Write a protein that binds this ligand. Structure first.
Ligand SMILES: [Zn+2]
Ligand SMILES: [Zn+2]
Ligand SMILES: [Zn+2]
Ligand SMILES: [Zn+2]
Lengths: 139, 71, 147, 136, 147, 71
């Protein structure tokens, strides 16, 4: 009788093991789902990273010095340059570097300077410190 | 169809165009994006300038050709 | 170097102009060794032409200096390789950049300007006997620009 | 005795399975933590983005992102439409009240706005298109 | 409404000015019912003053319209509650906003301007007998602004 | 020490200041950031304007006080 008892106990143990295996499989599936979610999150953030690093480099750089504009000035022809850069240019030529229209007016642009400071503030401390150095150097 | 233009600073812009569009027409679209008047734009494809009266079809410019802009 | 020179220098290595190679000198960061492929459908087609480019101190206020180092038969290139191109002197502006110059030089090969005031003497042959001048251009390409 | 030995082996196997399950749970917890960190990174990015949007590239007159940005001699900028309407009543900067001596279109401002707005929701992009049409 | 009006309207509900309540009318989205607390250390302190504010069609090109609806003894507020404040007429610019006006009005209570050209008649009392005028301001606050 | 100024548009800027600094001095720093000349600035703290000859110490303005700017 302890015979059938031991066999019955063994069968129960086997059933428990099977249940544990099923639980492990479920856990593995959950882990896979979590990994997929993480990948999706990375893709969402990766696009933002791509935008950030095609934001602050392709449209805010002076064509004369290849730096983010320092003391941005906008000409009558609507093109902008660093104040320092365009003044040096104008000692030699009175045509817009970009469109070559005769320069008739300059104005500083608070909005461009403020936008650039905010953008640069999100870049590496190397980029931020370089900008600080040029600002003082051209001061 | 879309084509690319490599601007003065070496950046790329995309234009929405047709094969029938004239070069003047393409220059008008470039002015809107770059602020460079048509008469100051010289557009180059395959090493040669594109003349104002001609169309994109005439220069075998196609889907995703790149035009180069100089002064 | 100024940021712009650094910018352009690395744009040349990263984003090479079609048919044009441009490498920095091993001793001078403002000095570049350029090879221009002869433009398609030109008498220079199939040839390769050495050019040297130098960015002066006052660049980009001052124009880049460029000269052919390969002998070439062209109305706007003289016997010493000096290039007659108005954006290298008259119409130079700091917005132009280096690769604009290089493409313009390539375009000069593609479409010579014999009618230029300060043109060679080759120009005269190009004006009066264009067919012969074009064959001579091809001849010089065979002789000087195929190695 | 043999049956007892088999039972003991089964118990050992069950214990091993339990340990494996615990390890899996720990891994899942680590993954969850990583996901939370990623969300925080994305949240910070969103914050950086709502930075230029809301207080910055906005015309002070209409509170919209500049439409055909123009810059005055005093270095302040406005929508072309807004400053043109203002100047029907006063020839002075709405911000600093200096006499207006020049008005200059700004391609860089316009291109930056257009390029950034192109990444935002359909609702935001569409509002801008409507406003441009209305002003037109 | 224009985005700006929507913007300001909801900024008023979300970010209320200290000592000032401003609620939209139940029928007119450009019409606001304002309550200004008498400023600290003023003869109006402890009082509450009703104001109405209207944003005209041409706002923000045109200034907002504002008037007191609570009787008040002040050199720059007349018998009908009309406010003499130069940013409501002369020095109005589209950058000012609504809450600037409201704070300025509050500040006018805190520091009256008897020497104003287009001032009441209360002004004259305020100039010659400031002590009596201030007590009368407090008197009117007791009488009209405590309920 | 730093203080905050709430500008015309309701935005906040930070100024680097000393307790000894005059109000004129603070207005000079505001002009540099906002482009509003000193004579057009009226600075308000605790409901009262700050007069030009006086210092920050005189108005008990301290570390991280907020000044309000109106015209
Ligand atoms: Zn520059
Ligand atoms: Zn220009
Ligand atoms: Zn506007
Ligand atoms: Zn201004």
């Amino acid at each position: 009788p302890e015979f059938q008892e031991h066999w019955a106990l063994m069968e129960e143990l086997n059933r428990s093991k099977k249940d544990f295996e099923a639980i492990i499989q479920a856990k593995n599936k959950e882990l896979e789902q979590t990994k997929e979610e993480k990948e999706k999150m990375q893709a969402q953030k990766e696009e933002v990273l791509s935008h950030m690093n095609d934001v602050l480099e392709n449209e805010l750089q002076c064509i004369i010095c290849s730096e983010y504009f320092i003391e941005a000035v906008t000409l009558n022809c609507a093109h902008s340059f660093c104040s320092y850069c365009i003044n040096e240019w104008m000692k030699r030529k009175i045509e817009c570097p970009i469109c070559r229209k005769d320069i008739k007016s300059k104005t500083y642009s608070l909005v461009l300077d403020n936008c650039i400071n905010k953008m640069v503030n999100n870049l590496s401390s190397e980029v931020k410190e370089r900008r600080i150095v040029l600002i003082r150097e051209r001061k | 169809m879309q084509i690319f233009v490599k601007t003065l600073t070496g950046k790329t812009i995309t234009l929405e165009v047709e094969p029938s569009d004239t070069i003047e027409n393409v220059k008008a679209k470039i002015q809107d994006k770059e602020g460079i008047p048509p008469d100051q734009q010289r557009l180059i494809f395959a090493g040669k300038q594109l003349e104002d009266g001609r169309t994109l079809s005439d220069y075998n410019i196609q889907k995703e050709s790149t035009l180069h802009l100089v002064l | 170097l100024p940021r712009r020179i650094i910018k352009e220098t690395q744009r040349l290595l990263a984003e090479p102009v079609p048919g044009i190679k441009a490498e920095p000198d091993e001793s001078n960061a403002r000095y570049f060794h350029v090879v221009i492929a002869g433009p398609q459908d030109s008498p220079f087609e199939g040839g390769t032409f050495k050019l040297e480019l130098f960015l002066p101190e006052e660049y980009p206020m001052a124009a880049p200096k460029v000269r052919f180092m390969t002998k070439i038969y062209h109305p706007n290139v003289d016997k010493l390789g000096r290039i007659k191109l108005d954006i290298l002197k008259d119409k130079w502006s700091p917005a132009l950049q280096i690769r604009t110059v290089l493409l313009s030089i390539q375009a000069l090969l593609s479409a010579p300007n014999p009618d230029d005031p300060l043109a060679n003497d080759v120009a005269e042959q190009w004006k009066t006997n264009e067919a012969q001048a074009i064959e001579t251009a091809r001849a010089w390409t065979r002789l000087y620009a195929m190695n």
